[PDB]
Amino acid sequence: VSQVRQNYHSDCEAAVNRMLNLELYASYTYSSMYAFFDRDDVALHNVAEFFKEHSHEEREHAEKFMKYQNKRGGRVVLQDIKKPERDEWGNTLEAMQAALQLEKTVNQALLDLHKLATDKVDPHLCDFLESEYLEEQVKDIKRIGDFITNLKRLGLPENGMGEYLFDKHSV
Amino acid sequence: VSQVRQNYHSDCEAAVNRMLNLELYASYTYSSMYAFFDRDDVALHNVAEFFKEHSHEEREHAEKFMKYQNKRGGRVVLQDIKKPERDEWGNTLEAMQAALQLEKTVNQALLDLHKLATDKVDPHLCDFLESEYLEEQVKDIKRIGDFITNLKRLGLPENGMGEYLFDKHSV
Amino acid sequence: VSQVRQNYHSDCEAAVNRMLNLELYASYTYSSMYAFFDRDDVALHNVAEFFKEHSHEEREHAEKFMKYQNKRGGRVVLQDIKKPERDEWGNTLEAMQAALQLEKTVNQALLDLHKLATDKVDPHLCDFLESEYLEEQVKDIKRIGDFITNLKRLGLPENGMGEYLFDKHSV
Amino acid sequence: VSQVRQNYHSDCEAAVNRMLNLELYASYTYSSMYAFFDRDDVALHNVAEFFKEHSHEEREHAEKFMKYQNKRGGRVVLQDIKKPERDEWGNTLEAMQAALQLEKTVNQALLDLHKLATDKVDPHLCDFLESEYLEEQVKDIKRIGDFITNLKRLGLPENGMGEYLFDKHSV
Ligand SMILES: [Cl-]
Ligand SMILES: [Cl-]
Ligand SMILES: [Cl-]
Ligand SMILES: [Cl-]
Ligand SMILES: [Cl-]
Ligand SMILES: [Cl-]
Ligand SMILES: [Cl-]
Ligand SMILES: [Cl-]
Ligand SMILES: [Cl-]
Ligand SMILES: [Cl-]
Ligand SMILES: [Cl-]
Ligand SMILES: [Cl-]
Ligand SMILES: [Cl-]
Ligand SMILES: [Cl-]
Ligand SMILES: [Cl-]
Ligand SMILES: [Cl-]
Ligand SMILES: [Cl-]
Ligand SMILES: [Cl-]
Ligand SMILES: [Cl-]
Ligand SMILES: [Cl-]
Ligand SMILES: [Cl-]
Ligand SMILES: [Cl-]
Ligand SMILES: [Cl-]
Ligand SMILES: [Cl-]
Ligand SMILES: [Cl-]
Ligand SMILES: [Cl-]
Ligand SMILES: [Cl-]
Ligand SMILES: [Cl-]
Ligand SMILES: [Cl-]
Ligand SMILES: [Cl-]
Ligand SMILES: [Cl-]
Ligand SMILES: [Cl-]
Ligand SMILES: [Cl-]
Ligand SMILES: [Cl-]
Ligand SMILES: [Cl-]
Ligand SMILES: [Cl-]
Ligand SMILES: [Cl-]
Ligand SMILES: [Cl-]
Ligand SMILES: [Cl-]
Ligand SMILES: [Cl-]
Ligand SMILES: [Cl-]
Ligand SMILES: [Cl-]
Ligand SMILES: [Cl-]
Ligand SMILES: [Cl-]
Ligand SMILES: [Cl-]
Ligand SMILES: [Cl-]
Ligand SMILES: [Cl-]
Ligand SMILES: [Cl-]
Ligand SMILES: [Cl-]
Ligand SMILES: [Cl-]
Ligand SMILES: [Cl-]
Ligand SMILES: [Cl-]
Ligand SMILES: [Cl-]
Ligand SMILES: [Cl-]
Ligand SMILES: [Cl-]
Ligand SMILES: [Cl-]
Ligand SMILES: [Cl-]
Ligand SMILES: [Fe+2]
Ligand SMILES: [Fe+2]
Ligand SMILES: [Fe+2]
Ligand SMILES: [Fe+2]
Ligand SMILES: [Fe+2]
Ligand SMILES: [Fe+2]
Ligand SMILES: [Fe+2]
Ligand SMILES: [Fe+2]
Ligand SMILES: [Fe+2]
Ligand SMILES: [Fe+2]
Ligand SMILES: [Fe+2]
Ligand SMILES: [Fe+2]
Ligand SMILES: [Fe+2]
Ligand SMILES: [Fe+2]
Ligand SMILES: [Fe+2]
Ligand SMILES: [Mg+2]
Ligand SMILES: [Mg+2]
Ligand SMILES: [Mg+2]
Ligand SMILES: [Mg+2]
Ligand SMILES: [Mg+2]
Ligand SMILES: [Mg+2]
Ligand SMILES: [Mg+2]
Ligand SMILES: [Mg+2]
Ligand SMILES: [Mg+2]
Ligand SMILES: [Mg+2]
Ligand SMILES: [Mg+2]
Ligand SMILES: [Mg+2]
Ligand SMILES: [Mg+2]
Ligand SMILES: [Mg+2]
Ligand SMILES: [Mg+2]
Ligand SMILES: [Mg+2]
């Protein structure tokens, strides 16, 4: 094994690789949402840029897991980044709903990884997840939920004026 | 009695203690409104922060009465701060209506205290209320009334777009 | 349940509400100590301001729990804020002793909440308590203990000169 | 009568003259206390300067009454400024006790004047007293009371070390 490796279970190393892939998958889904809202027949540029920013955030999350893997003496193993579930995202409300579910999926994987780290008695990995991922995840989920509440209030999906107003005053 | 005490009636001392409690009660009601508008299923953050600010204002009012009591040689006596009348506040219009009534309740108590001070021939207490409370109270009541008129104009409670617009352009 | 809610046990939600109340209770006790030391027949203004600052600190702790509750999709439920155990606080030593016991009471509640969070496998709540409460609590307890040792050294409660010196050189 | 005179009762004009004299009397008493604490066999220079400052404050109060009298069309009438009640002031505690009683005497005269103004339906004179005198009077009485409490705590009159400490840390 690696000269630096200490208290790092094989199961955790593997789960970190899977988590890295999931972050990349989330990044790619957000990239797709960006492209959709940038379409001339959708044209909600502030919404598009919100999703573009989130795409970059998730890529940063993945890169941080790569650095982590090496810090612990694990080995980064990459798999295909699957294309997003949809090619088009309907409207701001549908996209935000998809984003909420994606964020809860990523959150569940983080929590599962934390449970594994706990079971394997790895406090460094626990600390890493708590300090670098779990709170940002809760914050993002709350932001998206807040947005969804406001989009519903604004009459989405039917109310195009409401959709315009959201893009101009919320993002 | 206190070495500093001069022209300070026992009834006024007691009424100052009751007034202090009422300010704390008002603070707590506003805290509740803050928490409500911060909910993910309510999500009107500018409205929430308006009420949070008012919560702090009312706490400051209470602290000023504590300092006053001691300046006159009276003794601060605290009672329980009762929880607010409601656990949830409906919407921006219902909350503002509740805030207006709360402010008029606090105003009536200030005016009653001023009448007591007048009856007991206490010009210092009269001056204190006039200079530190009565005008801020009138200003706050006018602001909230103005808000209510605008919320009605915007179609509250039914018009969610109107509610969004208020949060984005009035607070 | 709330659209944002994930891995948040009902027992933890309820315990957060109780913790919030306890912080408000601690705030109110410190407010009482402030008013006491501000009395013309007590007149230890640096001591009074120490307790006033702590009163504001505890209110901030409570507000942070409100924000937390909403972030997790729980619902803030308020109860009466009970008046402090005493109406007068004796002297600097008695007040500091009461403050130490209050701080240990608040600390025990935080630790109990952390244990509940651990049992319910909620690392986000664990992190929150560790990062935002538990160390400040230990620091405050140590500061107050240090003060008590010094007040005893200075001959409290009997030595009024010692009490004056503390107010002028320690706070 | 004066071309400017309006709603200014002869009794109020006379009472303003008496009030002016009392302020000058208070100034002179404080001047005496200054000189006493500046003595080589007393030598508490911070205490001396406190009383010197108060002497100037009271002279300013008197001058403001002169300006007031003329503003209303009354006529300033001066009488002898009586020498202070004592030629020597014992110690810091005795002097502060004398200062407290002097301040309460001045306060009573202000309150009596306010009552006269009220009876004669003179709101300008009421406002003047409330805005320029009554609160400063309450503040000064509280400060002196606080000092007395601390001087007693420090073991005055017997405890010379306590007296030294007060001069060095309270004024
Ligand atoms: Cl290992
Ligand atoms: Cl180990
Ligand atoms: Cl292993
Ligand atoms: Cl792997
Ligand atoms: Cl890191
Ligand atoms: Cl694959
Ligand atoms: Cl999807
Ligand atoms: Cl599709
Ligand atoms: Cl998903
Ligand atoms: Cl896992
Ligand atoms: Cl562990
Ligand atoms: Cl984080
Ligand atoms: Cl929002
Ligand atoms: Cl929004
Ligand atoms: Cl009285
Ligand atoms: Cl009177
Ligand atoms: Cl009375
Ligand atoms: Cl009372
Ligand atoms: Cl004030
Ligand atoms: Cl009660
Ligand atoms: Cl109500
Ligand atoms: Cl309710
Ligand atoms: Cl009300
Ligand atoms: Cl009253
Ligand atoms: Cl009056
Ligand atoms: Cl005001
Ligand atoms: Cl308005
Ligand atoms: Cl608009
Ligand atoms: Cl408005
Ligand atoms: Cl849950
Ligand atoms: Cl879970
Ligand atoms: Cl549950
Ligand atoms: Cl509860
Ligand atoms: Cl926080
Ligand atoms: Cl209760
Ligand atoms: Cl106690
Ligand atoms: Cl008591
Ligand atoms: Cl306790
Ligand atoms: Cl608990
Ligand atoms: Cl856990
Ligand atoms: Cl902390
Ligand atoms: Cl210390
Ligand atoms: Cl110390
Ligand atoms: Cl006239
Ligand atoms: Cl008239
Ligand atoms: Cl006349
Ligand atoms: Cl005259
Ligand atoms: Cl003036
Ligand atoms: Cl004469
Ligand atoms: Cl005398
Ligand atoms: Cl003499
Ligand atoms: Cl006198
Ligand atoms: Cl008079
Ligand atoms: Cl009048
Ligand atoms: Cl004044
Ligand atoms: Cl003092
Ligand atoms: Cl002092
Ligand atoms: Fe980032
Ligand atoms: Fe992520
Ligand atoms: Fe994310
Ligand atoms: Fe932990
Ligand atoms: Fe941590
Ligand atoms: Fe304020
Ligand atoms: Fe108020
Ligand atoms: Fe108010
Ligand atoms: Fe607009
Ligand atoms: Fe703080
Ligand atoms: Fe606390
Ligand atoms: Fe505390
Ligand atoms: Fe002055
Ligand atoms: Fe004066
Ligand atoms: Fe004076
Ligand atoms: Mg090797
Ligand atoms: Mg392996
Ligand atoms: Mg495929
Ligand atoms: Mg953190
Ligand atoms: Mg006494
Ligand atoms: Mg009484
Ligand atoms: Mg009840
Ligand atoms: Mg004013
Ligand atoms: Mg829902
Ligand atoms: Mg529950
Ligand atoms: Mg009770
Ligand atoms: Mg820390
Ligand atoms: Mg003429
Ligand atoms: Mg005349
Ligand atoms: Mg004579
Ligand atoms: Mg004033």
XYZ file of N, CA, C and O in Angstrom, chain A residues 82-148:
268
model
N -22.140 9.790 -16.895
C -23.382 9.564 -17.627
C -24.049 10.877 -18.007
O -24.036 11.834 -17.229
N -24.634 10.916 -19.202
C -25.363 12.102 -19.645
C -26.575 12.341 -18.742
O -27.065 11.411 -18.085
N -27.069 13.591 -18.691
C -28.222 13.853 -17.829
C -29.488 13.093 -18.230
O -29.600 12.607 -19.365
N -30.430 13.001 -17.290
C -31.658 12.226 -17.477
C -32.542 12.794 -18.574
O -33.319 12.062 -19.196
N -32.428 14.104 -18.792
C -33.250 14.813 -19.768
C -32.394 15.629 -20.716
O -31.291 16.047 -20.359
N -32.915 15.852 -21.921
C -32.269 16.698 -22.917
C -32.823 18.112 -22.900
O -32.171 19.044 -23.376
N -34.031 18.260 -22.367
C -34.672 19.566 -22.226
C -35.358 19.602 -20.867
O -35.765 18.563 -20.351
N -35.491 20.794 -20.296
C -35.844 20.921 -18.876
C -37.161 21.641 -18.588
O -37.444 21.997 -17.439
N -37.969 21.818 -19.626
C -39.337 22.328 -19.470
C -39.414 23.819 -19.227
O -39.767 24.595 -20.121
N -39.099 24.216 -17.998
C -39.209 25.604 -17.566
C -38.464 25.765 -16.244
O -37.918 24.799 -15.725
N -38.428 26.984 -15.707
C -37.692 27.239 -14.467
C -38.150 26.360 -13.294
O -37.318 25.874 -12.519
N -39.460 26.157 -13.160
C -39.980 25.323 -12.072
C -39.557 23.866 -12.227
O -39.059 23.275 -11.271
N -39.735 23.287 -13.418
C -39.323 21.889 -13.623
C -37.832 21.713 -13.380
O -37.400 20.720 -12.782
N -37.036 22.670 -13.850
C -35.590 22.576 -13.684
C -35.206 22.648 -12.217
O -34.387 21.854 -11.752
N -35.801 23.595 -11.493
C -35.532 23.724 -10.061
C -35.954 22.489 -9.272
O -35.251 22.074 -8.344
N -37.088 21.900 -9.647
C -37.541 20.658 -9.026
C -36.533 19.531 -9.275
O -36.203 18.774 -8.361
N -36.031 19.435 -10.507
C -35.005 18.448 -10.840
C -33.712 18.711 -10.061
O -33.049 17.769 -9.605
N -33.362 19.988 -9.909
C -32.174 20.381 -9.157
C -32.316 20.002 -7.687
O -31.370 19.487 -7.086
N -33.501 20.222 -7.116
C -33.735 19.834 -5.728
C -33.537 18.336 -5.543
O -32.855 17.906 -4.613
N -34.117 17.543 -6.438
C -33.993 16.095 -6.310
C -32.550 15.645 -6.503
O -32.087 14.739 -5.806
N -31.840 16.303 -7.418
C -30.430 15.990 -7.659
C -29.612 16.299 -6.409
O -28.776 15.494 -5.978
N -29.864 17.462 -5.815
C -29.151 17.844 -4.610
C -29.416 16.893 -3.445
O -28.508 16.614 -2.657
N -30.647 16.395 -3.330
C -30.973 15.452 -2.259
C -30.338 14.095 -2.523
O -29.962 13.389 -1.592
N -30.201 13.745 -3.798
C -29.499 12.522 -4.175
C -28.026 12.614 -3.790
O -27.483 11.693 -3.172
N -27.390 13.730 -4.134
C -25.987 13.956 -3.775
C -25.852 13.982 -2.249
O -24.952 13.351 -1.685
N -26.778 14.668 -1.579
C -26.759 14.709 -0.118
C -26.855 13.316 0.503
O -26.119 12.997 1.440
N -27.753 12.482 -0.020
C -27.880 11.134 0.512
C -26.589 10.348 0.358
O -26.207 9.603 1.256
N -25.912 10.528 -0.770
C -24.650 9.835 -0.988
C -23.566 10.301 -0.017
O -22.785 9.492 0.482
N -23.525 11.601 0.256
C -22.608 12.144 1.255
C -22.890 11.572 2.640
O -21.964 11.212 3.373
N -24.172 11.496 2.995
C -24.576 10.992 4.300
C -24.250 9.508 4.412
O -23.773 9.040 5.459
N -24.481 8.772 3.323
C -24.125 7.350 3.285
C -22.618 7.169 3.466
O -22.173 6.283 4.206
N -21.834 8.027 2.809
C -20.384 7.970 2.937
C -19.948 8.294 4.363
O -19.020 7.674 4.890
N -20.634 9.242 4.998
C -20.317 9.604 6.371
C -20.597 8.438 7.312
O -19.845 8.214 8.255
N -21.677 7.709 7.034
C -22.040 6.538 7.818
C -20.983 5.451 7.668
O -20.614 4.787 8.651
N -20.501 5.266 6.443
C -19.440 4.299 6.178
C -18.173 4.698 6.929
O -17.538 3.862 7.574
N -17.815 5.975 6.844
C -16.652 6.502 7.545
C -16.768 6.288 9.055
O -15.794 5.932 9.712
N -17.969 6.507 9.586
C -18.256 6.270 10.998
C -18.064 4.790 11.348
O -17.416 4.460 12.341
N -18.599 3.907 10.513
C -18.508 2.472 10.769
C -17.071 1.987 10.746
O -16.697 1.109 11.530
N -16.263 2.586 9.870
C -14.857 2.211 9.733
C -13.948 3.001 10.669
O -12.724 2.842 10.641
N -14.559 3.830 11.514
C -13.859 4.624 12.534
C -12.792 5.513 11.884
O -11.609 5.478 12.237
N -13.239 6.298 10.908
C -12.365 7.210 10.170
C -12.796 8.654 10.440
O -13.625 9.217 9.710
N -12.251 9.261 11.508
C -12.685 10.611 11.858
C -12.205 11.670 10.877
O -12.857 12.703 10.727
N -11.084 11.421 10.202
C -10.600 12.379 9.217
C -11.604 12.525 8.069
O -11.903 13.640 7.640
N -12.128 11.397 7.597
C -13.093 11.408 6.507
C -14.416 12.013 6.975
O -15.035 12.790 6.246
N -14.832 11.671 8.196
C -16.000 12.320 8.809
C -15.860 13.837 8.838
O -16.764 14.552 8.384
N -14.734 14.320 9.365
C -14.454 15.757 9.440
C -14.495 16.402 8.055
O -15.062 17.481 7.883
N -13.877 15.738 7.082
C -13.819 16.251 5.719
C -15.221 16.477 5.173
O -15.533 17.553 4.635
N -16.075 15.470 5.331
C -17.435 15.566 4.815
C -18.232 16.646 5.546
O -18.928 17.447 4.918
N -18.088 16.704 6.868
C -18.814 17.698 7.667
C -18.358 19.128 7.375
O -19.182 20.057 7.321
N -17.054 19.297 7.180
C -16.449 20.620 7.036
C -16.509 21.164 5.618
O -16.494 22.387 5.431
N -16.553 20.271 4.627
C -16.423 20.678 3.220
C -17.653 20.422 2.352
O -17.781 21.029 1.282
N -18.550 19.539 2.798
C -19.705 19.140 1.981
C -21.088 19.276 2.607
O -22.002 19.772 1.955
N -21.257 18.807 3.841
C -22.614 18.612 4.375
C -23.374 19.909 4.603
O -24.570 19.977 4.329
N -22.690 20.943 5.083
C -23.363 22.232 5.264
C -23.654 22.963 3.944
O -24.740 23.521 3.787
N -22.712 22.948 2.998
C -22.989 23.536 1.681
C -24.201 22.850 1.033
O -25.032 23.508 0.388
N -24.314 21.538 1.236
C -25.423 20.767 0.696
C -26.757 21.209 1.295
O -27.731 21.408 0.572
N -26.799 21.364 2.615
C -28.016 21.838 3.277
C -28.387 23.245 2.806
O -29.565 23.533 2.558
N -27.380 24.105 2.656
C -27.605 25.479 2.201
C -28.184 25.517 0.796
O -29.134 26.247 0.528
N -27.601 24.732 -0.105
C -28.077 24.660 -1.484
C -29.499 24.117 -1.583
O -30.309 24.620 -2.358
N -29.796 23.073 -0.817
C -31.146 22.501 -0.801
C -32.162 23.538 -0.314
O -33.230 23.677 -0.890
N -31.815 24.284 0.732
C -32.709 25.326 1.237
C -32.934 26.432 0.197
O -34.062 26.871 0.009
N -31.866 26.865 -0.472
C -31.984 27.888 -1.519
C -32.915 27.434 -2.633
O -33.798 28.187 -3.044
N -32.725 26.205 -3.115
C -33.542 25.696 -4.209
C -35.004 25.534 -3.769
O -35.922 25.878 -4.512
N -35.215 25.052 -2.549
C -36.562 24.915 -2.013
C -37.249 26.265 -1.948
O -38.412 26.396 -2.341
N -36.525 27.266 -1.448
C -37.044 28.638 -1.397
C -37.459 29.107 -2.785
O -38.536 29.695 -2.951
N -36.600 28.847 -3.776
C -36.909 29.191 -5.160
C -38.188 28.512 -5.646
O -39.029 29.148 -6.286
N -38.329 27.220 -5.357
C -39.502 26.479 -5.811
C -40.783 27.082 -5.227
O -41.765 27.284 -5.939
